[PDB]
């Protein structure tokens with residue numbers, strides 16, 4: 001067509017200019033390749049973590065700079081590159097396109113357009129490795145993030161800027177809760193107030209291309225692709241792609257954050273990123289530190305997740321909410337990679353396989369799922385109702401274990417046990433069903449205030465739907481008041497109490 | 507502007523232009539509903555009178 | 564219709580790619596070596612002189 005011709009002419013003119021300018025400013029001869037790591041001679045004054053051009057066409061980057069030989073990890077298939085290939089250096093640190101044009105576009109780790117929808121329009125290029133903001137640039141997490149899960153994700157919130165972990169086994173709902181959060185962000189990014197929009201960005205690292213295709217299909221089915229970036233590295237490409245894709249997603253997240261906007265990033269299954277770094281380090285001549293893992297895995301998780309922060313008003317008040325995901329084996333949260341990531345994050349969301357198999361689709365264990373925004377960085381309506389409900393539910397679980405231990409004044413005779421079991425049955429959700437914050441307070445308020453003593457565990461599922469229909473049909477006054485105010489006052493508390501003990505009889 | 511070789515946008519535009527008057531709305535709830543309602547208030551006033559006099563008795 | 568047109572653009576692009584590679588193979592056979600060798604030798608000479 002017309003555009004390819006002029007684009008090709010302009011770019012080849014620039015190519016001739018580059019070839020005729022300063023020679024190439026450095027080169028190298030390939031000494032070894034394999035598993036996406038390539039040794040190369042030359043490159044005497046190569047910059048650290050610097051992109052390099054290979055004669056075949058594969059990209060590269062410099063993790064290691066030995067005397068004489070340079071450790072280059074190959075960005076793509078290593079089949080094309082051979083021995084003696086000339087390795088031109090790009091002259092700049094590893095970068096990735098960042099800007100508002102990445103919205104609605106799927107790109108690789110390097111930022112090149114892979115969805116085939118056209119070129120990427122970026123305001124600038126940001127380094128994949130960027131130092132995290134300092135103490136003063138960081139701000140206390142106070143702005144809520146509407147997870148839309150109608151579960152413990154609401155009573156103990158996420159908030160804007162938290163790196164709330166999502167631990168659990170495979171196929172437990174980590175990607176499910178991530179996509180529900182992304183879908184629920186549509187209600188707030190579909191407006192005009194940029195201070196409340198959450199421009200999501202997905203990191204589908206170590207995810208099969210069929211799965212990510214289904215994920216993007218589901219996103220655009222719900223009109224969620226307009227605000228979500230799917231920068232990722234599937235299982236098809238090499239390990240360095242997997243290692244760098246979350247970091248470039250972090251770069252996009254800081255671009256959104258440094259511009260005063262709020263972005264939600266979900267590092268889906270960082271485990272493949274860690275093992276990709278393992279694959280790099282095994283043949284890059286970096287000895288492993290512990291449990292066959294190189295020591296720098298904790299450091300890389302640190303730099304990647306600490307970039308996620310809530311900026312202060314001086315820096316633009318931007319937020320970079322992070323939702324890291326780890327795939328543990330057999331629920332072993334005491335393994336190495338778990339221990340580091342649970343110590344790297346601001347709380348976690350446990351998703352055990354037994355709860356998923358039991359029937360609870362969210363499958364979240366209240367007892368261990370903690371956060372640093374307890375009754376903070378919430379709407380306010382939910383924070384007053386269930387500011388300390390997690391501890392009560394944990395004590396309910398302990399007493400229920402204690403209740404089965406011996407026959408005493410326990411079981412149904414315990415008001416705490418009854419309230420805990422009713423609340424645990426309350427905290428459930430179906431996938432692809434984002435529930436707004438307004439239709440979440442009455443259920444938890446009925447649970448916490450002991451209004452569910454005579455509703456029975458089996459009937460709580462129907463009670464949820466009946467109560468929500470009650471509010472959305474003939475009690476929309478207080479519901480809309482809560483939604484618009486973002487808080488339940490004395491008037492709103494009294495109205496909600498009126499509704500709940502009027503509907504307790506049904 | 508998204509489509510270049512449309513060849514169909516005029517056809518669908520005309521089809522929707524000719525489709526908006528689907529048919530006349532019924533709005534004819536005045537043949538059995540009205541009779542039911544008439545009987546409703548008639549014997550409802552009758553019942554109100556009888557319960558009132560029963561209360562006085 | 565818009566996604567059909569997008570597929571049309573993609574197939575036109577890949578047909579252009581096939582035409583480009585076919586013309587590259589054609590250039591691999593015709594005597595198109597000495598003139599371009601002189602041309603980019605002069606280009607590299609000018610590149611050296613420019614610095």
Ligand SMILES: Nc1ncnc2c1ncn2[C@@H]1O[C@H](COP(=O)(O)OP(=O)(O)O)[C@@H](O)[C@H]1O
Nearest residue numbers: 169170171172173174175176361362429430431
């Ligand atoms: N109501 C529900 N909530 C969550 N997941 C559901 C629900 N109903 C069915 N599922 C299934 O649970 C699966 C979630 O798997 P997922 O968490 O994406 O795996 P992984 O943890 O490896 O990313 C989906 O494939 C979906 O088919």
Ligand SMILES: [Mg+2]
Nearest residue numbers: 175207268269
């Ligand atoms: Mg998944």
